[PDB]
Amino acid sequence: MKSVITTTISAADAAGRYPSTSDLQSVQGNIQRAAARLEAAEKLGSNHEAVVKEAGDACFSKYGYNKNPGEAGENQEKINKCYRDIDHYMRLINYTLVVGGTGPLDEWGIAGAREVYRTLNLPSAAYIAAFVFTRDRLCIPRDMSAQAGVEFCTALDYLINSLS
Amino acid sequence: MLDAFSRVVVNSDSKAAYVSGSDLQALKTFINDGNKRLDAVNYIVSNSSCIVSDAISGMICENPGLITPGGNCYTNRRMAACLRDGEIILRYVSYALLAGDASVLEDRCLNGLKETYIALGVPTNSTVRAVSIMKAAAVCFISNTASQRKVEVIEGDCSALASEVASYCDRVVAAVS
Ligand SMILES: *[C@@H](C)C1=C(C)[C@H](CC2=N/C(=C\c3[nH]c(C[C@@H]4NC(=O)C(C)=C4[C@@H](*)C)c(C)c3CCC(=O)O)C(CCC(=O)O)=C2C)NC1=O
Ligand SMILES: *[C@@H](C)[C@H]1/C(=C/c2[nH]c(/C=C3N=C(/C=C4\NC(=O)C(CC)=C4C)C(C)=C\3CCC(=O)O)c(CCC(=O)O)c2C)NC(=O)[C@@H]1C
Ligand SMILES: *[C@@H](C)[C@H]1/C(=C/c2[nH]c(/C=C3N=C(/C=C4\NC(=O)C(CC)=C4C)C(C)=C\3CCC(=O)O)c(CCC(=O)O)c2C)NC(=O)[C@@H]1C
Ligand SMILES: *[C@@H](C)[C@H]1/C(=C/c2[nH]c(/C=C3N=C(/C=C4\NC(=O)C(CC)=C4C)C(C)=C\3CCC(=O)O)c(CCC(=O)O)c2C)NC(=O)[C@@H]1C
Ligand SMILES: *[C@@H](C)[C@H]1/C(=C/c2[nH]c(/C=C3N=C(/C=C4\NC(=O)C(CC)=C4C)C(C)=C\3CCC(=O)O)c(CCC(=O)O)c2C)NC(=O)[C@@H]1C
CATH of domain B1-177: 1.10.490.20
Which 25-84 residues of chain A touch chain B by CB within 8 A? 27-28, 31, 34-35, 38, 41-42, 44-45, 48
Q: Identify the CA nearest to B67 among candidates B89, B49, B48, B82.
A: B82
Query: CA B39 to CA A24: how far, in whole Å?
Result: 9
Q: Is A41 in contact with B5 (Cβ distance < 8 A)?
A: no
Residues belonging to the binding site of A are 82, 139
Query: CA B33 to CA A145: how far, in whole Å?
Result: 24
**A3: which strand partners?**
none
Q: Identify the CA nearest to A158 among candidates A68, A96, A87.
A: A96
Query: CA A148 to CA A154: how far, in whole Å?
Result: 10
Contact A20, B91 (CB under 8 A): no
Q: Is B42 in contact with A24 (Cβ distance < 8 A)?
A: yes
Ligand 1 neighbourhood includes B76 CB (under 6 angstroms)? no
Query: CA B16 to CA B7: how far, in whole Å?
Result: 14
Query: CA A51 to CA A137: how far, in whole Å?
Result: 9
What is the Cα gyration radius of chain A?
18
Query: CA B24 to CA B17: how far, in whole Å?
Result: 12
Residue in A with minimal Cα distance to B38: A24
Q: Identify the CA nearest to B43 among candidates B167, B151, B130.
A: B151
Provide the domain count of chain A: 1
Task: Enter the DSSP assignment of B164.
Answer: H
**How many residues would you count in chain A?**
164
Query: CA B109 to CA B87: how far, in whole Å?
Result: 12
Query: CA A80 to CA B138: how far, in whole Å?
Result: 54
Contact B31, A34 (CB under 8 A): yes
Q: What is the phi/psi pair of residue B71, to 5°?
A: -75, 145
Task: Enter the DSSP assignment of A138.
Answer: -
Query: CA A39 to CA A138: how far, in whole Å?
Result: 14
Q: Is B3 in contact with A6 (Cβ distance < 8 A)?
A: yes
Resolution (A): 2.8
Helix (H, G, I), strand (E, B) or coil at A158: helix
Q: What is the phi/psi pair of residue B75, to 5°?
A: 70, 155
Residue in A with minimal Cα distance to B39: A24
Helix, strand, coil fractions of chain B, as percent rounded to 5? 70, 0, 30
Query: CA B133 to CA A115: how far, in whole Å?
Result: 53
Q: Identify the CA nearest to A73 among candidates A132, A122, A119.
A: A122
Which 95-134 residues of chain A touch chain B by CB within 8 A? 95, 98-101, 103-104, 108
Domain of residue A55 covers 1-164
Q: Identify the CA nearest to A84 among candidates A115, A44, A54, A52.
A: A52
Ligand 1 neighbourhood includes B133 CB (under 6 angstroms)? yes
Query: CA A41 to CA A45: how far, in whole Å?
Result: 6
Chain A contacts of B9, Cβ < 8 Å? 1, 95, 98-99, 104
- Kindly report each contact of residues B74-78 with a partner whose C-beta sits within 8 Å and lies 24 or more positions away, as own/partner: none
Cα A91–B23–B20 angle (5° rounding)? 45
Contact A134, A55 (CB under 8 A): yes
What is the Cα gyration radius of chain B?
18
**How many residues would you count in chain B?**
177
Contact A89, B13 (CB under 8 A): no
Contact A29, A3 (CB under 8 A): no
- For residue A45, CA distances in Å to A41, A51, A52 come to 6, 10, 11
Q: Identify the CA nearest to A19 among candidates B96, B168, B5.
A: B96
**B69: which strand partners?**
B71
- For residue B66, CA distances in Å to A1, B16, B90, B141, B177 come to 42, 53, 21, 28, 19
Q: List the CATH number of the domain containing A151.
A: 1.10.490.20
Secondary structure (DSSP) of A19-32: P-HHHHHHHHHHHH
Q: What is the phi/psi pair of residue B167, to 5°?
A: -60, -35
Work out the minimum CA distance from B8 to partner chain A, whole angstroms.
9
Contact B31, A35 (CB under 8 A): yes
Nearest CA to ligand 4 atom 13: B85
Element (H, E) at A118: helix A113-119
> CB under 8 Å to A118, separation ≥6 — which residues?
none
In B63-153, which ranges are continuous DSSP H helix?
Answer: 76-99, 103-108, 113-120, 124-142
